[PDB]
DNA sequence: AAGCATTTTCACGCATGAGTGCACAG
DNA sequence: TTCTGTGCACTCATGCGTGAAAATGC
């Protein structure tokens, strides 16, 4: 990414979130009585931005920006993820296909969302270093 | 009787960044 | 041969701030 300038001369980066200093600066200016505009004009952060933090702020108290990005669990779904663990807890010596060939047959998952051996010994090792934390 | 200021909204164009499944290796 | 661990490249459905138009407010 790069920063930029806005149409305030703030320094802004496209797609990515203010940081927590000016986010901080934000709340902080609202609770010493200054309107949305007014921190806006001294922070030089657009008023929408400033509407969006502000508010976010007095619903859940929290200044930190959410999760960019990622994804969702396609194939390692959490019932998924609980019969895997289901099939190693009755037989631990079973392997990564056997399990495979089980969430497919009980119909756990169909063709087009069954995981890829990899995935499930992935989903596997995942449940391993779980138990350890 | 007349407008500018504020605040609210959200389409945009951006940058991801979790989850997945390969090739490769032990 | 099989299997499972590593490292990678890919994917898109997210959330970002901005800018500007639509509401309100004053």
């Not at 703030?10 to 200054?34: C, K, M, Y």
């Not at 993820?81 to 969430?103: G, T």
Request: overall charge positive.
């Amino acid at each position: 990414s790069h920063s930029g300038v806005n149409q305030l001369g703030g320094v802004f980066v496209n797609g990515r979130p203010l940081p927590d200093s000016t986010r901080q600066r934000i709340v902080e200016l609202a609770h010493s009585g200054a309107r949305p505009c007014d921190i806006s004009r001294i922070l030089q952060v657009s008023n929408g931005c400033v509407s969006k933090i502000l508010g976010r702020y007095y619903a859940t108290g929290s200044i930190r920006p959410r999760a960019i990005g990622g994804s969702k669990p396609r194939v390692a779904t959490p019932e998924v993820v609980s019969k895997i663990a289901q099939y190693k807890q009755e037989c631990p010596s079973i392997f990564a296909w056997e399990i495979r060939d089980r969430l497919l047959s009980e119909g756990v998952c169909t063709n087009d969302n069954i995981p890829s051996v990899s995935s499930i010994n992935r989903v596997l090792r995942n449940l391993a270093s779980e138990k350890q934390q």
